[PDB]
Design a protein around this ligand. Structure first.
Ligand code: 6ZL
Ligand code: 6ZL
Ligand code: 6ZL
Ligand code: 6ZL
Ligand code: URI
Ligand code: URI
Ligand code: URI
Ligand code: NA
Ligand code: NA
Ligand code: NA
Lengths: 415, 419, 406
């Protein structure tokens, strides 16, 4: 039974979290059982029942329209280098990453800046964040962080509650970090889409990341102390421009990091290839090692053993490098001309498991940005780095288990 | 048939009227200043378009800068290789023109070029000459004269740098004159950008020079000088800061600055064009063929007709002028150059194309307010609240200035020039 | 066929020029300068003459060439098919897009060196080579570490290892740091020259000879007249991924600044050539070639090719090495009209391998001041003299090259 394989996976994830908990006898049951109940509720809502799949389908239509609007600005700026004739000439190379993926960071950063300026995002965060604190009993600040994290990046997310950060507790801070590592940004989300990644999965994952982030944040470090209970751009054109420039230099940083990471990985594979020549192989790669290593974890979360090696590589690459490298090697399996055709339930698991910033490199990003908001807490942030990555990774896997289960029930994923 | 003078003088009268009606103190208006500015602007406008000797000078200047832009393209050809080559059109067609590779690098080169010209001492002299001419004829203060004269060549934030010890304690009318002169003007860097997009270069040069008196015109009309202009002896100019080591440093530094500027503009344009199409999606979804371009056009259609555009082509000019004010000139020009193509479905009259060219030539938009507020505060932090207050008024001042030159354009492009 | 006299002639002239421009010729440490000259010509004879050394140099060339290939994988990922071979089937000569072929190498090698700094490899290489230079030349530990570091990294990143010692270091030590930076390259832009076409083994050798050559003319122009510090230490990113990412971002904005500088410089040069060609075929290239022709002849270039080498070296000093190399690789094509000898191609490749130009003065002033702001006045004052020192160093390695080729 699929439900047995999924419930087992959920059991493993929750068990590992408790074993890594700082105070196991201090764990708030109402919070974590409520959080787990919400994440699986949203899971059943968007992936199982027809009404929710239609609502999710309408959302995909809307945001894709927005992405298309962004591409109008991309077509204007980069002319025919993003035209259709690129494939007619360069074939697969017709898809230029730096011109089709990175500019979406620029557009959405400006769009989010406009939405913040109008007052739309404050409303959405206040509503969703309010629902969380009312159900889970978490504080207001860490709750608002999760809602922001659904839409914006891990660094931009706590900005809405940034004066509360310098005084907030150990658990509240970790919850902000975990909620940050569990969720992507809307900017890079459209980036994944332009690479070929299924949009509806990314939407659902972004919403599930908020309670899932809180789930493993209250499991690893439950609230042991007292909380703190309480309660600019010139014009709209300035906000749009300010967001564009911000998203521009972010995109340059992202594009430069990927160019370096990919090249370094190939360099490592060259080293492992030579040294591994005496090990009886020589054709060994880092991808295979990660896949062979993370193979058990892939099988636990619902992936068949035949594809557990593949899923292991993608999950492995995600944590040690980033999600972009993972998704870049993942879309290669989504091609209809692929030698190895993945199952539908597998693709859903991976799509949810990979949707997160939880990696070794995001730690320094957290440290830098979260310190600018709270400099005296900088030592605390860097200390909770690894544990937060774990919390974020477990949140992604929880969403993956839930996803693979509901696709095993009534399946759906267009090629 | 020579009724154009009536239609033009009407437009001139309307533009000056709107200014006077929006003035802070109508009885404080210095007639010798505003009549001088209007007379100078129409004199320059006539001279370069009308008389043969003036057309030759504008043509000589055009050929000079055209060669400069060509020199810049050598660097572009070097850096981006064949992505800016001729066979880009043989392959991609119209899409062979890559805006990021054809336009933005010109911002880099000219920013480095102007850095060299400021280093040799050339630009300080030109500003000192033209600025001195404006304080003699218009009676405006020394500071606002240098700023207005500077704005002809450089940007709105870079221009007041030559008078930055004056900015701290200058009056509102002077402060408003600096802001207006910056909004009614362009930058030589982005000017070369418009040229590559297809915009007529001679019109740009003419509009750039008319920006200074036209700026001071509506600056002294909206906010006249009711206080004392500072004298040199009373001002102590706080020291120094960086001066570039040598000419190679100056060129390299200016290039890097122009590079990050080109990045900021490029990203802003990607966002703006996208957000515009997103608004068209919202409107088109709520309303069907209704777009923001059409609304802005239908809205500014009368104002387009006032300045001398035929009603058949008034809707188009309305969209372009509209898009300029609410977004920027790059978006306006990008839509304008499509009407300049020989195989274009919609064909405009020669006089209309000129009117639009001059009307669009200016930084007068809602975004430039925040640009001024930022850069002008770095020079004088105590005046930041005052700058932000006069933001909208100054944009209007810049708009009226650009429109005034456009009226003059249509009037003297009302014959056989066609430069 | 004994150009050994012509080479020794070149060495003599260069050293003589250095001595004449010195502050205190009576304070020159002979053991230091003769040692530095001895080491530089020893390295030359090792990697360019004797078989066992050419092999090691060839192996290092092969290794780094593989590293470069690994970097291109990341480049192929980012910029897709605009770096494919189809570009040549379409655009031909223009298929080679500089901004896409060369600049991203700076990003990759700035991240890689950041990793090597993180692992602890570079700290070891600096400590070993630096200790070798303080023992043989008698130079202070700090200025030896900086010179050794300048082999791998840039002029502003090299003194970062001896950063706390810069505030209290002497006039001669400071100049030696500046000279070491101007006489040397970075591994980032080194891979950039390789992608243009410039022979990798020459770039390898030149980068290693840069350190003792820099120390040579630094202790010649301003010898140590004060008391120094004896012992010195080499001496943060959260993890290796942070270091690799940070190095990439730094290299990115660096690549932006470099590319923009080239676009301007190239365009400004074409503008000057347009001014000169006015009525009221002479170019800035030819003029600089006409001026630096004698100095090109002294270092061992045949007079028939002295005009060409003069332009290239001339452009290097007044503009930069990228502009110089970009017009030098045109002579390395088999389809070129003017062919050059193998010895000349080696001479120019070594002479142009350095940041020593008029524009690098401001770069030194900027970065070296961030490390020691009270010494900013001293750095700017010694700017031109340091450019001379770096230039003479590159010329020395060029003489050594032309000598040991054959
Ligand atoms: C729902 C949104 C469900 C999203 C999950 C609708 O929320 C209501 O949206 C419109 C807003 O106006 C309403 O203010 C907003 O309620 C969620 O329904 C209720 O919304 C409340 C806040 O949005 C949440 O519970 C509340 O409990 C207390 C007051 O009712 C307070 O703690 C605080 O207002 C809030 O936590 C909760 O989502 C639910 O009761
Ligand atoms: C090391 C990089 C040093 C950093 C340069 C830093 C550069 C700073 C100047 C070099 O990295 C890798 O080293 C291994 C040697 O263990 C090379 O092995 C190669 O061996 C054969 C080549 O002759 C062949 O099997 C393959 O090319 C490869 O396995 C790797 O190529 C090399 O990347
Ligand atoms: C925008 C939504 C912003 C959501 C932030 C999204 C936040 C992402 C994190 C607004 O989205 C637009 O909504 C309208 C309806 O309100 C849709 O109408 C129609 O637009 C087009 C008409 O030409 C048509 O192609 C579409 O099919 C039709 O829906 C727009 O599509 C939609 O973009
Ligand atoms: C942004 C605008 C700034 C323009 C500054 C340069 C123009 C100087 C000018 C026009 C100035 C009036 C602008 C007015 C702007 C109002 C819109 C005309 O000068 C002409 O310059 C060119 C180029 O230098 C000369 O030709 C040369 O071009 C190439 C560069 O040297 C070279 O390859 C060619 O061999 C060479 O021919 C022209 O000879 C020169 O005339 C100065 O105008 C003055 O006008 C006066 C009246 O005739 C005279 O005095 C004389 O002609 C000349 O000095
Ligand atoms: O808005 C963003 C986008 C990216 N990143 C960082 O960049 C990596 C690649 O997108 C992510 O994993 C994350 O560490 C952020 O912190 N915020
Ligand atoms: O040198 C420049 C170029 C552009 N801009 C700003 O960027 C907008 C688009 O060019 C202009 O309207 C102006 O606000 C400047 O301020 N200075
Ligand atoms: O790592 C580097 C690379 C370049 N440059 C500066 O940039 C110029 C062009 O590469 C060089 O001459 C030098 O002045 C540095 O300072 N450090
Ligand atoms: Na997020
Ligand atoms: Na201006
Ligand atoms: Na160096």
């Amino acid at each position: 039974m699929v439900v047995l394989h999924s419930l087992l996976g959920m059991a493993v994830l929750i068990a590992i979290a408790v074993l890594l908990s700082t105070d196991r006898k201090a764990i708030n049951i109402r919070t974590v059982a409520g959080a787990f109940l919400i994440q699986v509720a949203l899971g059943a809502l968007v992936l199982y029942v027809p009404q929710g799949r239609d609502m999710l389908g309408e959302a995909s239509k809307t945001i894709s329209n927005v992405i298309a609007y962004g591409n109008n600005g991309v077509d204007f700026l980069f002319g025919g280098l993003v035209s259709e004739k690129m494939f007619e000439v360069f074939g697969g190379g017709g898809f230029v990453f730096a011109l089709r993926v990175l500019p979406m960071i620029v557009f959405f950063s400006s769009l989010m800046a406009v939405l913040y300026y109008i007052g739309v995002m404050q409303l959405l965060i206040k509503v969703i964040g309010g629902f969380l604190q009312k159900m889970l009993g978490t504080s207001k600040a860490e709750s608002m962080s999760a809602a922001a994290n659904i839409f914006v990046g891990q660094t931009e997310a706590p900005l809405v509650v940034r004066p509360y950060i310098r005084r907030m507790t150990e658990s509240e801070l970790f919850a902000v970090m975990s909620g940050g590592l569990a969720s992507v940004a809307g900017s890079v989300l459209a980036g994944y889409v332009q690479m070929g990644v299924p949009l509806p999965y990314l939407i659902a994952a972004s919403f599930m990341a908020a309670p899932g982030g809180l789930l493993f944040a209250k499991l690893l470090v439950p609230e042991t102390e007292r909380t703190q209970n309480d309660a600019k751009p010139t014009n709209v054109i300035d906000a749009a421009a300010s967001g564009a420039v911000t998203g521009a230099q972010i995109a340059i940083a992202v594009g430069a990091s990927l160019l370096a990471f990919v090249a370094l990985i190939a360099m490592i594979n060259g080293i492992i290839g030579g040294v591994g020549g005496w090990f009886g192989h020589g054709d060994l790669t880092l991808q295979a090692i990660l896949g062979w290593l993370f193979s058990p974890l892939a099988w636990v979360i619902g992936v068949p053993w035949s594809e557990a090696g593949i899923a292991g590589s993608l999950i492995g690459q995600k944590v040690v490098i980033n999600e972009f490298v993972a998704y870049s090697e993942f879309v290669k399996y989504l091609k209809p001309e692929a030698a190895v055709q993945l199952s539908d339930t597998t693709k859903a698991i991976i799509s949810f498991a990979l949707c997160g910033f939880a990696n070794l490199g995001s730690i320094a990003v957290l440290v830098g940005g979260l310190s600018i908001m709270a400099p005296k807490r900088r030592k605390d942030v860097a200390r909770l780095g690894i544990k937060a990555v774990v919390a974020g990774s477990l949140s992604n896997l929880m969403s993956a288990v839930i996803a693979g289960l509901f696709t095993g029930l009534s399946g759906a994923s267009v090629l």
